[PDB]
Symmetry: D2
């Protein structure tokens, strides 16, 4: 009765988490747990219906070719998807029109909603800024998520005057990093995990959208949601947002 | 040859909202103030001066009379006045059948930020195990919780129908600690000197939380939404309820 | 060279955490790890200098009598200290004037500072309220910490007019719980751990003091601070605050 | 027989701060406005009307002249004017030796909330691995970061001397992402329409964080601290620097 779910990259950090979550879920049956060395025929041997793939950019295309050829739906968190790679995936899917592939940069439902909300709000305010706050072991400033969020905001603000700012005197860096005309401030503080606030303002009011992750495994519910719903959309879907079915 | 602006009248012009809108219409380059009426002024002044659209924040006792005149004369109406029952909305709809070109918009909130917040709360509500509302206002406010907080909590509850209720292990408590229960959604009302009008909607599931916060630092923060409604009101014939459709979300 | 630290109640949840932290600290040597059944003579047999005690209210007095008699300093997190118990501890200490005992309800440095700050600010504003937010497995609303904080605030506001409030119409519970004239609001939300905000306001400005704990073991640095500094104050100290040496 | 109030003069009375203080002194029941002077008015008006204390928010170019007169005449001074070098503070001190009963208070910030925040930041700073400042202001502000944020970061750095610096694994970044470095303390400056003046100081160690936030929603939020200084200024003979001693913390 339960949906048969395989996990590729099962010994990686994300994969191993997803293995546990699939096992715990009552309505999902773990049908495979593969890492480098394991033949993909194990997926078809055990009647896997959908896989979760967080492998490495160097192997994901090989995985996807097999999956699609065998009508096995794929929930993909692996990065490194160039325009040429997306195009290849699309062509493979022409031959297998009932197969579904989802490729998403972010699976945390809260982060996905937060980005969508920021996109909807952006054109209705004079000012927009992003503040992100993370643990002080993080290599990159600003985060991937903050940079992608600021780009969405910029894109949605097409044609608007830039953010008003009378700054004439400053210490270097005080106004943050400029991502497509949107300031992005990166706080690195012991005691934090992963946090992001998007601020919008016009004379008289402000609107703030804040996402807090308190545990590194907070994406799990979005991956499982993608697994349960992935077959609703035939073909290739990019990003988790369409799956949320926002009216 | 450049067209003069849209001719805008304001009803209830000596009220606090009206007077603000009078100033904002005068300041706007694309809008011409064609009337500023309060109780005692005949509505024929609107047609005498070729008013195209009115802003109406009057009183529930007069608004239906205003709307009947406006619709009969093909004058669009942006209405912030409350007290709209199902019977009243129906009456407005039937008046409009005879005047298909005319547009009426009735909205309980014109602050763009508050409208977006409620919309966001509605979209997020089904995706999290827990939802709560915290609202914070100046300490001269008569009602706890606010109208906006109560409406927000109701939208949230509605969108969560067929989900399990909020998890809560509370077995021992001081009375009131868990807030007011609005359709299974806790609502907490802070009253603090130095505040104006503030609302936070909180959503959570194990591992993450999402917070939507709206701050109004000035009582006149609705102005940009009323003006938006005025500029765009004619795009939709007939009756529109709420500002949200006009945002084109 | 390193200070010899024993832990009583070592198989309890707090004790076991403190055992690990003592072992990890370079300047502290774990000299005993006792639970029910173990004779206290093990403390003196192994030259223990200071103990951490998070046992049970039913045993703590017996522990303290022995510790004091043997000149062993005590950092005590166990509750259930009545006025009669504090008095007994004080009398035992008369005979042993160089021994130190610290009894504290809260060891998280951030929570201790937050309570002290709230106390200092309280008399300078027209309004004060407490919002606490916790995971939804918590039995008590409001928390112990929030209730103690609101009491400190009330006490510091002696003689002031009560909080201004024009509320004439309300749903039951909307204005929170009244702790000595101070509203306390208790949020219970999945995804949270332990969080507290104290809000102060007068016309024109507000001041907010917020403490966030993201992990249940965030008290550890305060217990260790108490252990390192406990001998600076002879006799009985109640609360961690005096140890922080706030000028 | 009930004593009339304390006789308070305001210098720079037509300036924005002065005019506000004139109104606040007039409104206060225990204080009598005895003078309201601006440039052009002779200081002898203060002694002619038996002024006991003045509030001075004038300009750095005149304040020393004002203070010399005030101290010579035994008139207490509550001073918000900036530009006080070590040489100026020393000059004030020496004037006061001759007039031991007189009190002068010079303070860079009179908002009680801002004074407490800085004090709290100073007390907390040595107890956490990380410290950062975020300040948020209206987008007409010329300077980034604000004066108050820069001063706060300096206090924090000073209180953290002999601690390891803030931990940070940043190896790759866009320019400016990590804020401005003020004495090893990151300071981030947000400029957003709809804001007034806001500051958050953040402290953290693995497992917990502590945040101190000050919000000013109105430009006149300093008034209660100036009045406090006026009422209490005579309790301390001589020169006091900063409002913090008067709070009795
Ligand atoms: Cl990371
Ligand atoms: Cl990221
Ligand atoms: Cl309301
Ligand atoms: Cl608990
Ligand atoms: Cl507690
Ligand atoms: Cl400043
Ligand atoms: Na399962
Ligand atoms: Na105009
Ligand atoms: Na050790
Ligand atoms: Na007066």
């Amino acid at each position: 009765s339960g949906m048969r779910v395989g996990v590729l990259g099962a010994k990686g950090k994300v994969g191993a988490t997803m293995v546990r979550a699939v096992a715990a879920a009552d309505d999902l049956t773990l049908s495979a747990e593969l890492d480098a060395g394991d033949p993909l025929s194990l997926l078809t041997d055990g009647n896997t219906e959908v896989v979760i793939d967080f492998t490495h950019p160097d192997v994901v295309m090989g995985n996807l070719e097999f999956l699609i050829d065998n009508g096995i739906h794929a929930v993909v968190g692996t990065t490194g998807f160039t325009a040429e790679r997306f195009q290849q995936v699309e062509s493979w899917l022409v031959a297998k029109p009932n197969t579904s592939v989802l490729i998403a940069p972010n699976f945390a439902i809260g982060a996905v909603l937060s980005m969508h909300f920021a996109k909807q709000a952006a054109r209705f305010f004079d000012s927009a800024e992003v503040i992100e706050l993370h643990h002080p072991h993080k290599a990159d400033a600003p985060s991937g998520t903050a940079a992608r969020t600021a780009k969405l905001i910029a894109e949605a603000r097409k044609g608007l005057p830039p953010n008003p700012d009378a700054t004439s005197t400053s210490l270097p860096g005080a106004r943050g990093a400029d991502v497509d005309g949107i300031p992005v401030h990166a706080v690195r503080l012991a005691g934090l995990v992963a946090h992001q606030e998007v601020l919008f303002g016009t004379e008289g009011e402000t609107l703030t959208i804040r996402h807090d992750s308190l545990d590194r495994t907070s994406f799990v519910p979005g991956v499982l949601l993608a697994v349960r719903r992935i077959a609703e959309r035939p073909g290739l879907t990019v990003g988790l947002e369409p799956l949320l079915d926002l009216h």
